[PDB]
Amino acid sequence: FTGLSKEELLKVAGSPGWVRTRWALLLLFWLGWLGMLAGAVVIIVRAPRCRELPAQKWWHTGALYRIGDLQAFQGHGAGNLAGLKGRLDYLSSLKVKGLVLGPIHKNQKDDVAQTDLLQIDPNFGSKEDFDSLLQSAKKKSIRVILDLTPNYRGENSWFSTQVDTVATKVKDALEFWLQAGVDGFQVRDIENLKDASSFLAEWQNITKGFSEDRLLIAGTNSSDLQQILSLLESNKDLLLTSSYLSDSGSTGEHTKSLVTQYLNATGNRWCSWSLSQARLLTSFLPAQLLRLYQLMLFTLPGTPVFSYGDEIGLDAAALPGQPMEAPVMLWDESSFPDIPGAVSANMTVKGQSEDPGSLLSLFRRLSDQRSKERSLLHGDFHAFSAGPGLFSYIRHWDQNERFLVVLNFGDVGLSAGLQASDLPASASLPAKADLLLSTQPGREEGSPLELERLKLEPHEGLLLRFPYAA
Amino acid sequence: VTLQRNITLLNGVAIIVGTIIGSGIFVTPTGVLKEAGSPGLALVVWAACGVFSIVGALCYAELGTTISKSGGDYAYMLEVYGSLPAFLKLWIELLIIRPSSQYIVALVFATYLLKPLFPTCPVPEEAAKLVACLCVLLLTAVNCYSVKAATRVQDAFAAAKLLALALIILLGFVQIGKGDVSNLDPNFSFEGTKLDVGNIVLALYSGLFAYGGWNYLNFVTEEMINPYRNLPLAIIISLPIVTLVYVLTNLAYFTTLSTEQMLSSEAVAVDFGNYHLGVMSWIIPVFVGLSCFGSVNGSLFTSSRLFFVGSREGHLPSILSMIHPQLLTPVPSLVFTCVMTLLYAFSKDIFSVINFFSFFNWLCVALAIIGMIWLRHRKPELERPIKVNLALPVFFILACLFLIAVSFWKTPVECGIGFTIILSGLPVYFFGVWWKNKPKWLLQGIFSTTVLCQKLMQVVPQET
Ligand SMILES: *[C@@H]1O[C@H](CO)[C@@H](O[C@@H]2O[C@H](CO)[C@@H](O)[C@H](O)[C@H]2NC(C)=O)[C@H](O)[C@H]1NC(C)=O
Ligand SMILES: *[C@@H]1O[C@H](CO)[C@@H](O[C@@H]2O[C@H](CO)[C@@H](O)[C@H](O)[C@H]2NC(C)=O)[C@H](O)[C@H]1NC(C)=O
Ligand SMILES: *[C@@H]1O[C@H](CO)[C@@H](O[C@@H]2O[C@H](CO)[C@@H](O)[C@H](O)[C@H]2NC(C)=O)[C@H](O)[C@H]1NC(C)=O
Ligand SMILES: *[C@@H]1O[C@H](CO)[C@@H](O[C@@H]2O[C@H](CO)[C@@H](O)[C@H](O)[C@H]2NC(C)=O)[C@H](O)[C@H]1NC(C)=O
Ligand SMILES: CC(C)C[C@H](N)C(=O)O
């Protein structure tokens, strides 16, 4: 209606030049499409590839919980172990991937003959309740680790002279509990055992032969780096916890040196980060440093290990009369009716359950971040120099969201005083990054902050996060 | 020189399925789960979306049977309300709503096709953009080449995606039958935002987006053999199958992946394939890409037909709606649609914005049903082969106002912006339609441009 009709177009657009132009345009379009495809292929091939998948085990995902004694953990009426099923929801809230359970085998003080590794103590429960607990834990996706200390009641944990008979009985109990359905084993006081290295090697070999998803935990009170390295000469897939990191109580650079030396000697292998084997966090640290150490342990490249009640900062000195080895858990305000004393929300599970500035909330957030982030899962470690009393390092796996952690062990405020000194160019820190949390309330979240003039309050921790770049 | 009458019942059913099944089923579950949490809440939300879509499809089938004119959802409003509302809808239809679904589907296809090469590290965006552009160009070329070829491609890809969904359902059922349970029995454990209607409508937005394209057959009517019997039959054959497939796939998803791992994941299909296969796990992204390819191919046809029919009323330049001899295809409309779709490549993330203008999209449907009931009431003379019992359109409009009231109660400034955009079509309308006796220098200029395009593309005006 606003152009040439059919006959007019037929008469006009009949010249050979027009059909040649149409043919040329069609050819140009097709070659342009081919060139676009070739450019896409070129941009595909000239690109870095994904790095790898480490294929980590189940215990590489999250932290481990050491129940230890059962009576103190659940207060009165804790004799039956099936009652721990009612506490499994608490562990799921804590989202722990393991559970170190205390010794249950029959043991009458130092009576070697009266010590069966297959007999469950009547006060603790029965085999059927143990199987029910295992089934419930598997349903909730929490593994169970059982301790086999030959003497958990006497002063000598290895029955003194008796070495061959106890070795044979725990060797049999290995297969017995492995076919029972356990997920890992733990022993303690190895330093008090004669020529124990061969025993640990044999037990680790048996456990690995039974299955690939099994564990073996060893605990000693030796803080000598050389001794720990010697104990790891014949074994490399063994998780050992000791007092090497503890009993320092000094500046942050000392801890940095200790960690760097341990990583250098081990060879960037997989390790376990724990203050001690059976002691609480408060047993060696003041109340002002618990949050800093909790932040540090959840970011180091290893498997963190905690004792029961240390997520709420339980202290044994307070509420006197409780033995330091097995302090009672403070569930609620009435969790300790036997011993009247200090009762408040700052030191109860339900009291801290709603406080956003409490230890429990920080513990839950840190556990979630550790269990949900790939860089915190199997990233790399790089520590650079900082101010006199500041510990700083970064985590990054291949290309995911990077992490930066800065801690101030000093008791006075100071500036950042940091330089790049970064070996991986792909992990070079930019000037802009977000903030996740701090141990001291009074800061905002998610604000892109300059990474040059950080002012650190006494006993402060930071969780800088920056995205991947070139 | 009419276009053709070639679409059969099978072709229409295949078109519907291909269009309705694109990429929502493989993306929207994560968003709807984050916005609902409770698997039972998500399942009932999807069921409500399915029944709402079935209601709308039945009402639109009735309307299309009543008015046998091409370009649905726009010809009806032109017939009932006049000229201003129709052009007001079309002006934003050809700018925002239409040239956004095709680009998003193509981008999803490109991203999922290259997933096996980059399993962990994310794919570069430039390669995805290039692949999407290549897909759009190839699809518009094959659509322009012929009509039968497009139908054959649509049927082939619909069959492929149906087989893929059947395989997914079979794998889910096998996993269920192995003797393993999950949180499905103790559902509704979290049930957060139960009283917060804002999150409910937010999830319903994604659910309805996953159900989009249910009314695209009305656009391509007047081109299918015996529409009076084939259209409602095709709609009633297609819609319940889509609803059943969606609900079954949603059920089969949860039996394998936990809630937390589903929420934390970014490609639920990839995780499902990796878990259930381990090796040869690259089948799922390939099938997803094929489904998206079929969906965008289906959408382009309807968009081209809608632009064709609109230009016959003078709302668009006469260069459009200009058929080509020999092979009967609307080349200028397809070229315009392709070039407008490509123009969105110069944009950042657009998915977050796709929820924008959904209020107007569901508003126009409501006015269409109001026009239908108006015609049924005050014009009892048109021959209606199909008659729908009342209170069904009433329930549809009541749901429409329920959905539209929340969009005003919350996020009102983000609606006022956008609403100002739809109103911006008044000056262009008054310049291009209402205006007459314009200065002549423009007249021979546009005439010469139209003649140049006429000669360049060698097309014919719509004589009959
Ligand atoms: C330990 O298990 C392995 C495999 O069943 C065997 O020994 C391993 O391989 C060689 C050959 O004996 C040794 O030199 C390695 O030290 C062993 N690997 C380990 C211990 O991880 C053998 O069956 C077992 N050997 C002993 C001493 O228990
Ligand atoms: C663990 O603590 C005990 C308690 O003091 C210490 O073990 C000492 O070991 C030496 C030889 O290794 C022996 O004289 C005794 O067995 C212990 N000495 C005592 C009781 O005075 C030591 O501090 C720790 N054990 C280590 C590091 O192997
Ligand atoms: C322990 O000391 C250093 C501390 O890292 C280890 O690494 C050496 O130092 C440079 C500089 O950091 C590294 O780049 C090299 O890998 C090492 N240089 C050498 C070995 O010459 C060092 O390997 C350790 N020393 C030991 C194990 O004897
Ligand atoms: C909660 O935290 C601790 C115990 O968990 C307590 O800290 C007290 O703080 C007051 C004033 O800050 C000081 O007298 C002592 O540092 C603490 N007193 C006692 C009796 O423990 C206290 O229960 C709570 N902290 C408060 C209220 O700041
Ligand atoms: C609106 C349509 C483009 C959505 C389509 N059903 C898809 O999920 O791909």
Quick synopsis:
Chain A is α/β, with parallel strands linked by helices.
How much of the sequence lies in strands of chain A comes to: 5-15%
Order of H and E elements of chain A? HHEHHEHEHEHEHEHEHEHHHEEEEEEEE
How many beta strands in the DSSP annotation of chain B? Answer: 0
Number of helices of chain A: 13
So what's the oligomer here?
Answer: heterodimer
Would you tell me the structural class of the helices and strands of chain A? alpha/beta
- What hetero molecules are in the model? a molecule of 2 linked components (NAG-NAG), leucine
DSSP helix fraction of chain B = 55-70%
- In DSSP terms (H or I, runs of 4 or more residues), the helix count of chain B works out at 19
Morphology call of chain A: elongated
Reported for the largest beta sheet of chain A, the result is:
8 strands, parallel
Strand order of the largest sheet of chain A: 6-5-4-3-2-1-8-7
Report the largest inter-chain contact: A-B, 28 and 34 residues
The major beta sheet of chain B can be summarized as: none
C-alpha Rg of chain B, in Å?
A: 23 Å
Order of helices and strands of chain B: HHHHHHHHHHHHHHHHHHH
Question: Which radius of gyration of chain A do the C-alpha atoms yield?
Answer: 30 Å
Kindly state the number of beta strands of chain A: 16
